[PDB]
Ligand binder design. Structure first.
Ligand SMILES: CCNC(=O)OCCNC(=O)OCCO[C@H]1[C@H](O[C@H]2[C@H](O)[C@@H](O)[C@H](O)O[C@@H]2CO)O[C@H](CO)[C@H](O[C@H]2O[C@H](CO)[C@H](O)[C@H](O)[C@H]2O)[C@@H]1O
Ligand SMILES: CCNC(=O)OCCNC(=O)OCCO[C@H]1[C@H](O[C@H]2[C@H](O)[C@@H](O)[C@H](O)O[C@@H]2CO)O[C@H](CO)[C@H](O[C@H]2O[C@H](CO)[C@H](O)[C@H](O)[C@H]2O)[C@@H]1O
Ligand SMILES: CCNC(=O)OCCNC(=O)OCCO[C@H]1[C@H](O[C@H]2[C@H](O)[C@@H](O)[C@H](O)O[C@@H]2CO)O[C@H](CO)[C@H](O[C@H]2O[C@H](CO)[C@H](O)[C@H](O)[C@H]2O)[C@@H]1O
Ligand SMILES: CCNC(=O)OCCNC(=O)OCCO[C@H]1[C@H](O[C@H]2[C@H](O)[C@@H](O)[C@H](O)O[C@@H]2CO)O[C@H](CO)[C@H](O[C@H]2O[C@H](CO)[C@H](O)[C@H](O)[C@H]2O)[C@@H]1O
Ligand SMILES: CCNC(=O)OCCNC(=O)OCCO[C@H]1[C@H](O[C@H]2[C@H](O)[C@@H](O)[C@H](O)O[C@@H]2CO)O[C@H](CO)[C@H](O[C@H]2O[C@H](CO)[C@H](O)[C@H](O)[C@H]2O)[C@@H]1O
Ligand SMILES: CCNC(=O)OCCNC(=O)OCCO[C@H]1[C@H](O[C@H]2[C@H](O)[C@@H](O)[C@H](O)O[C@@H]2CO)O[C@H](CO)[C@H](O[C@H]2O[C@H](CO)[C@H](O)[C@H](O)[C@H]2O)[C@@H]1O
Ligand SMILES: CCNC(=O)OCCNC(=O)OCCO[C@H]1[C@H](O[C@H]2[C@H](O)[C@@H](O)[C@H](O)O[C@@H]2CO)O[C@H](CO)[C@H](O[C@H]2O[C@H](CO)[C@H](O)[C@H](O)[C@H]2O)[C@@H]1O
Ligand SMILES: CCNC(=O)OCCNC(=O)OCCO[C@H]1[C@H](O[C@H]2[C@H](O)[C@@H](O)[C@H](O)O[C@@H]2CO)O[C@H](CO)[C@H](O[C@H]2O[C@H](CO)[C@H](O)[C@H](O)[C@H]2O)[C@@H]1O
Ligand SMILES: CCNC(=O)OCCNC(=O)OCCO[C@H]1[C@H](O[C@H]2[C@H](O)[C@@H](O)[C@H](O)O[C@@H]2CO)O[C@H](CO)[C@H](O[C@H]2O[C@H](CO)[C@H](O)[C@H](O)[C@H]2O)[C@@H]1O
Ligand SMILES: CCNC(=O)OCCNC(=O)OCCO[C@H]1[C@H](O[C@H]2[C@H](O)[C@@H](O)[C@H](O)O[C@@H]2CO)O[C@H](CO)[C@H](O[C@H]2O[C@H](CO)[C@H](O)[C@H](O)[C@H]2O)[C@@H]1O
Lengths: 69, 69, 69, 69, 69, 69, 69, 69, 69, 69
């Protein structure tokens, strides 16, 4: 899967349908994987650099693959 | 969903029915989403600014949408 | 539910029946709510002030309501 | 010295003259005590509730007394 | 249940059968309680003093009771 | 020097004369040692148990000796 | 099970099939144990030294045993 | 003083002349204020959003004013 | 300088003469280096393993060399 | 100044002459800058990746320039 955006987490959002949205770089993306909710908030809280990989690389696109550095 | 309150978490409360209450700004609101319990306590512990979005924007009103900054 | 004790968590204990015991102020109380186990240890670790509300306000009494400040 | 404001630290600012500004509640106040710079940032980072005591309780007023809870 | 060992967590280990091993003092003990896995790692990470209570107080013995201080 | 109070830090206060006040157990004590200011706030933030040793064991009394556990 | 690699976690990755990949030393390894996802991210965040034990000690190999120091 | 850049700290650098460099947004700026060295590293470590204010808003420019949010 | 003790910090103590005492393993040792006071408390708070090197390897002996792992 | 080593901090050491030694990658290097002592321990504690720049790129060599990521 190709890299979409790399950077620090600007903000995260819990959605009404239980999905989770994250804003990294200039993209707002969402994921339906429940395990990723606490992992991404932890990366936000500790200033980690994350790389999100997805073919739906556009605002509102979904993802499941993330690299935490 | 419209913004209701934005601010730091003043306190949180675990309820007898397993719901979770949060006090942000001048509103006390609750949520029945289990995943949000640890996320909101983490935001409280790290001084994050949260925005709660809900149509029931009054004391005792419920919510499911939160932005963590 | 009336306030029972307010203070910092002195210690916590995982029990053989999977319940969790907490010592706050001069009372040792237990809870059978699984979600509260990590929330109370987090409050212990970060020096939070907690208020436990219960009608069984005596050593060995149970509770489910807690306010985290 | 009378209480001026109580609340969580909204933001802090390092000034050109080496003083430190803090925004708590609806007041922006500054202090010239060097030691308080790291203590206030730590309170900001850990979501502590602080009470600033000063007779110059107005925007731009200075202070030296702070209670950390 | 009698005290077995008291001290800081030296190391922890995730086992192939999903049990968790902990080394406290001069004993290596394991537990099959899933909830204790994150609680013990948190105690390890924050330098907490733990007391493990078990009748199988020998290397390889199991436990379920732990006091976190 | 005899033990005065043992417990968790309830609150700390920076004073106008640059001394630091701490409330542990039922005593409010102060210290004029600059180094202790960040050490005591760190103990407050991490829920450490501290023992303050002083012959002036009364409200307003001073101290310089502290054990961090 | 023999030791494969010992060192600090260089990065972690959540995969599309819900497995988790970790880079320690010169090896990229994955695990299908859900519990290990938050434990390994916590070790990454706190600079812990980990030892991964596996017979598939090569890039892409899987593991279930980890020692956290 | 006008805002120059707002964002998360991408990296920091200790220089041979004892000044400190920070990369925020698309600018690499330095400061000669010793107190700011630990404050900026703490903001980096906790993922804070900072605004640097300076008239020398270009790579290599210096600053002394920072807002920590 | 030969190794004296290796282990986790059991407790630390600020002394009346401004020296700092640490208990590691079965030895209580002190140091007069001011910089080491916050470094050792940080190692205590984060459960680090420290090795103290000193020729005065006995209770009450002094040291200046410490390895933090 | 050319890069010497990049990696996570393996261990740090306080020396008898008040200098500070750090082991990154395959090199043990020291610095005489007092400010860097707490900054490097913080990077060790939070698993940061550091790049040390120095012309004395060999065991025992000194440095003053470090990039914290
Ligand atoms: C676990 C089962 N998944 C599930 O139910 O997902 C439904 C939600 N997905 C969704 O709305 O899918 C819409 C298309 O977008 C996903 C995109 O799909 C690609 C596909 O892989 C390519 O083969 C195709 O050529 O193009 C489409 C459109 O771009 O794949 C992305 C990953 O690269 C995202 O999928 C991933 O993230 C979602 C949301 O979290 C699910 O988890 C997917 O399973 C995961 O693969 C886009 O959503
Ligand atoms: C999926 C599980 N939902 C469920 O069982 O929720 C029952 C709890 N709901 C509740 O008490 O509902 C009372 C009405 O309040 C919710 C409010 O509803 C709006 C509605 O969306 C509008 O269309 C309508 O015009 O007005 C009503 C009243 O204002 O919507 C809020 C969000 O905007 C809250 O709902 C949200 O939060 C609750 C509690 O956490 C549930 O999670 C809902 O699913 C979530 O949408 C008010 O509770
Ligand atoms: C929802 C599942 N509950 C369940 O299985 O609870 C079993 C463990 N409960 C138990 O031992 O209860 C014994 C009585 O003690 C509880 C006490 O009950 C009060 C009651 O509310 C009053 O109306 C009555 O006049 O007096 C009794 C006895 O004092 O209520 C307490 C709260 O105020 C505690 O209950 C709470 O905590 C337990 C354990 O965590 C359960 O979670 C309860 O559901 C919760 O309400 C006392 O245990
Ligand atoms: C360490 C010596 N202090 C010094 O150099 O302070 C100079 C900066 N002070 C300043 O600008 O003072 C201007 C007046 O404002 C201070 C205010 O003063 C009150 C005074 O308390 C009353 O008794 C008087 O009736 O009215 C004046 C005017 O309001 O006192 C405040 C505290 O209550 C503030 O002082 C405190 O904070 C400053 C800045 O950090 C200094 O640290 C002072 O020493 C400290 O007392 C107002 O600044
Ligand atoms: C949840 C149900 N438990 C279960 O499936 O446990 C199986 C794993 N247990 C195990 O291997 O038990 C073997 C015996 O060792 C346990 C020991 O048992 C004592 C017993 O308490 C005495 O009364 C008896 O006289 O002697 C036996 C033999 O020593 O008890 C220990 C506690 O004191 C340990 O049990 C505890 O820990 C295990 C593993 O985590 C289980 O959780 C047990 O439920 C828990 O009680 C020894 O394992
Ligand atoms: C090294 C600089 N010391 C200095 O300037 O101290 C001035 C502030 N001290 C002060 O107000 O002292 C008043 C008396 O109180 C101290 C108390 O003194 C005992 C004394 O040790 C006994 O021998 C005597 O019998 O009784 C008196 C009064 O009870 O000693 C306390 C410790 O046991 C406190 O002193 C300590 O704390 C202060 C303030 O932080 C200084 O740091 C002292 O140096 C330190 O020893 C009481 O303040
Ligand atoms: C929980 C049940 N496990 C399961 O469903 O695992 C499927 C994932 N396994 C996998 O792909 O297995 C492929 C072979 O690699 C594993 C390796 O297996 C060795 C085996 O131990 C030797 O006895 C044999 O001679 O050679 C094979 C080939 O290498 O064993 C490793 C551990 O030493 C790894 O297994 C472990 O990790 C995986 C992934 O997390 C599973 O959890 C296994 O259960 C666990 O044992 C290699 O994956
Ligand atoms: C504490 C005394 N300061 C001192 O010794 O600083 C020497 C380092 N200064 C430096 O190299 O100055 C070069 C010019 O750049 C500073 C810039 O200056 C502007 C000035 O504000 C305008 O009025 C003028 O028209 O143009 C000049 C040229 O740009 O001002 C910046 C702030 O807006 C920076 O200064 C600040 O940061 C430096 C380095 O940390 C010092 O701390 C300054 O005191 C501080 O004001 C540019 O460095
Ligand atoms: C630079 C400031 N030094 C100073 O003022 O130190 C006075 C405190 N020293 C002290 O009490 O010395 C008592 C003897 O104990 C130190 C011990 O000394 C060795 C010596 O190095 C050997 O050459 C000799 O053969 O035996 C003596 C006795 O064992 O050395 C120890 C380290 O190996 C300790 O010294 C270190 O720690 C102290 C206290 O922190 C000072 O920092 C010393 O500078 C430091 O070297 C014993 O205290
Ligand atoms: C602040 C004053 N510095 C001071 O007193 O430093 C004395 C300790 N330095 C030392 O032992 O120097 C020995 C040579 O090693 C340093 C090395 O020097 C280079 C030099 O820059 C080149 O121009 C020359 O061609 O080769 C020599 C040898 O390689 O420079 C290094 C930086 O690249 C190190 O210096 C840096 O670190 C030390 C220790 O912390 C001091 O802080 C230096 O000031 C700092 O520049 C080597 O130590």
């Amino acid at each position: 899967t190709p890299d979409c955006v790399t950077g620090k987490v600007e903000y995260t959002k819990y959605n009404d349908d239980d999905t989770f949205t994250v804003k990294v770089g200039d993209k707002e993306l969402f994921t339906n994987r429940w395990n990723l909710q606490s992992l991404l908030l932890s990366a936000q809280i500790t200033g980690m650099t994350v790389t999100i990989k997805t073919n739906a690389c556009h605002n509102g696109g979904g993802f499941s693959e993330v690299i935490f550095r």
